[PDB]
Scaffold this active site. Structure first.
Site, PDB file in Angstrom:
ATOM      1  N   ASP A 146      -6.112  -6.802   5.103  1.00 26.02           N
ATOM      2  CA  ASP A 146      -7.218  -5.995   4.616  1.00 26.02           C
ATOM      3  C   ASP A 146      -8.292  -6.948   4.113  1.00 26.02           C
ATOM      4  OD1 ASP A 146      -8.670  -3.698   3.960  1.00 26.02           O
ATOM      5  OD2 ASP A 146      -7.734  -3.485   1.981  1.00 26.02           O
TER       6      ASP A 146
ATOM      7  N   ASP B  76     -12.030  -8.273   5.985  1.00 29.63           N
ATOM      8  CA  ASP B  76     -13.315  -8.168   5.315  1.00 29.63           C
ATOM      9  C   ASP B  76     -14.010  -9.506   5.212  1.00 29.63           C
ATOM     10  OD1 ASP B  76     -13.234  -5.413   5.087  1.00 29.63           O
ATOM     11  OD2 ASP B  76     -13.412  -5.387   2.893  1.00 29.63           O
TER      12      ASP B  76
ATOM     13  N   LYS C 167       2.758 -15.623   2.860  1.00 35.08           N
ATOM     14  CA  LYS C 167       2.906 -16.305   1.587  1.00 35.08           C
ATOM     15  C   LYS C 167       4.409 -16.570   1.492  1.00 35.08           C
ATOM     16  CE  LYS C 167       0.883 -17.968  -1.918  1.00 35.08           C
ATOM     17  NZ  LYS C 167       0.132 -19.234  -1.686  1.00 35.08           N
TER      18      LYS C 167
ATOM     19  N   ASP D  99      -3.822 -17.944   1.586  1.00 39.60           N
ATOM     20  CA  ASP D  99      -4.855 -18.687   0.871  1.00 39.60           C
ATOM     21  C   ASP D  99      -5.537 -19.792   1.673  1.00 39.60           C
ATOM     22  OD1 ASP D  99      -2.232 -19.749   0.476  1.00 39.60           O
ATOM     23  OD2 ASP D  99      -2.884 -20.895  -1.280  1.00 39.60           O
TER      24      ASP D  99
ATOM     25  N   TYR E 280       0.808  -1.220   0.000  1.00 36.48           N
ATOM     26  CA  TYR E 280       0.000   0.000   0.000  1.00 36.48           C
ATOM     27  C   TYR E 280       0.842   1.272   0.000  1.00 36.48           C
ATOM     28  CZ  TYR E 280      -4.257  -2.782   0.662  1.00 36.48           C
ATOM     29  OH  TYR E 280      -5.296  -3.669   0.481  1.00 36.48           O
TER      30      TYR E 280
END
Lengths: 357, 356
Positions: free
Chosen positions: B246, B250, B190, B222, B141
């Site tokens: 993020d 959600d 990851k 994942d 970001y």
């Protein structure tokens, strides 16, 4: 009409499920006068044992000559002591790259007699019939630089790198897919932050003009996340990058309870593609006749549709699979409504029966 | 004890919900001699009017001298059509930046009365009680280069950058939170591809040594994705970098069917923190007495827990909330069992009424 299919069984349950698939495949084609050729090649541990390499030259030759390529599964404990380059998996990834496959399709359809296995309430997962398209080539994964600096390794970085072309080719195939389905496409990105995303969204918009019949919608990865749980029924076709795709693909897997019988396809620009089941080789069940052929069969179905435009033929297999499950049959792994357990062979025999009905 | 608190009601339903938090807070604090010193301030659109800027320097001073900062919400139609620099949101971003809050703690737990509404089958979503700790400062970001390279700008890139310290602090915080909870931390990354993740796991592993009483596990983003659906009850404290957090945040929002009463909190290396409900300003709802105060009320409890360590007090608030929901009460947004819609003041009254 005529089609040369490259068949690569592989290891473990690979051959079992492949035979099952071929059978179903053969009947369907026969019923419409189609003539097909199946050349079997080695890959994975088998190929290693017979040629020293998980992906021998002969196999590539066959694939290149073929109209499409059907794959079972690779893997096994016998080769787990070899260096990465000399293992089953390597041959698979190798084959994918050599054929230049950039798009990966992971459909997820809701099967009524399987909803009890879905982690979600029936009312939501009911009607789910989507396909997720993922960018296989570029992305944050292959982008350089990926390293530490400092000194003392005080700083680390990874790079999300995409070429306009890499984004164009995929969004194109996505459109063409949604076009033969419910003509609805969802370009998922993080355009609110990533610049790569902004480029993606632009190109999505551009390509859209070329496919005016397909409804383009834009969603941010994080929203799609919630939506795949609280309203997966809305999605028809979803196109997305490598990193995000990887995630979403896995999320969508569990929603229907059909994991285990999930097929996949790795397509490219033209009508060529490699189709294989998501499941592994599961060498433990090797020979025991419990291997579930549904995934591989549904793969053969995708093949007919995406690589040959044989919709009618494809739907036949899809129906068979549905009906048999509707009747409650399975090889043991799937949690079908009123459990009617049979073997790999029988479930197959059933599929054929439903075809000649 | 005494506690100075900055109260930034913001705009929209912000001041409505903020009231309830204050009332409840006082009701609880006056249990064992607790001097609650509140000092109101402006932010977002409200500030824009009576100060010209989304974040008045006055507000910053107010904040800098407070033990913790409670917040409502910012946003509104009025200011959405002006320049980016005069947009209410930046006040929030700025304040967060000024206070140096790096970790975003967002809890998700099951509430029996909402179980019928959850997207997950009762058996799965029931008993859920996790907290996702997300890194806010670095990552993909905030990292350049982030441009379209030639020729013809037919190439684009974004950079995921992290510093050893940015990681060390987020993980230590995570550990500390697990220690006050069920002592189970799931580091998500990851690490099989991302070098930043590879470094993350290394650090996660090292920090584990300092907190031997906490069970550390490493999951790939994942896998963690499908696990939040298939078996969310296995988690306690999840920690991960910006981008990943993020998304996961959600995802976990809907699983329990309580999105709308979910509280959040932005912390840093110390007891100081900013607490706010996850919901927006909801202008169209403003004034109509139909705003849900639960989200902010819970944020208040988190504040007492994470900033002041007043566990018994936070516990009481959360209990009260459950009980009200237990009696099938809400303002209309939630779908309680045998639902009864009442006004914001009303629920609050019941909350307090249950609070004793």
């Amino acid at each position: 009409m005529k089609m040369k299919l490259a068949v690569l069984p592989g290891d473990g349950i690979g051959p079992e499920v492949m035979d099952a698939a071929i059978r179903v495949l053969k009947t369907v084609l026969d019923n419409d006068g189609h003539e097909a050729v199946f050349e079997n090649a080695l890959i994975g541990g088998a190929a290693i044992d017979e040629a020293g390499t998980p992906l021998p030259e002969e196999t590539l030759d066959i694939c290149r000559r073929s109209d499409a390529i059907l794959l079972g599964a690779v893997g096994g404990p016998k080769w787990d002591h070899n260096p990465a380059s000399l293992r089953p998996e390597k041959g698979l990834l190798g084959l994918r790259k050599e054929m230049g496959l950039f798009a990966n399709l992971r459909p997820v359809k809701a099967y009524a007699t399987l909803l009890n296995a879905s982690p979600l309430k029936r009312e939501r997962v009911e009607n789910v019939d989507l396909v997720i398209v993922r960018e296989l080539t570029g992305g944050l994964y292959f982008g350089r630089p990926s390293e530490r600096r400092g000194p003392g390794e005080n700083e680390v970085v990874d790079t999300l790198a995409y070429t306009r072309e890499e984004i164009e080719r995929i969004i194109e195939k996505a459109f063409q897919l949604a076009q033969i389905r419910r003509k609805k496409l969802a370009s998922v990105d993080k355009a609110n932050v990533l610049e790569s995303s902004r480029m993606w969204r632009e190109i999505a918009e551009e390509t859209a003009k070329k496919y005016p019949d397909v409804e383009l919608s834009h969603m941010l990865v994080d929203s799609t996340s919630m939506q795949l749980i609280a309203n997966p029924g809305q999605f028809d076709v979803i196109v997305t990058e490598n990193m995000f795709g990887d995630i979403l693909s896995d999320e969508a897997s569990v929603i229907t309870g059909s994991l285990g019988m999930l097929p996949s396809a790795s397509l490219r620009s033209d009508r060529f593609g490699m189709y294989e089941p998501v499941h592994g080789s599961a060498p433990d069940i090797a020979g025991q006749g419990k291997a579930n052929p549904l995934g591989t069969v549904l793969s053969a179905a995708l093949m007919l549709r995406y690589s040959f435009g044989l919709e009618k033929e494809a739907a036949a297999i899809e129906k068979a699979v549905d009906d048999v499950l509707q009747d409650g049959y399975c090889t043991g792994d799937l949690q079908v409504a009123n459990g009617k357990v049979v073997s790999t062979i029988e479930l197959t025999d059933r599929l054929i029966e439903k075809l000649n009905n």
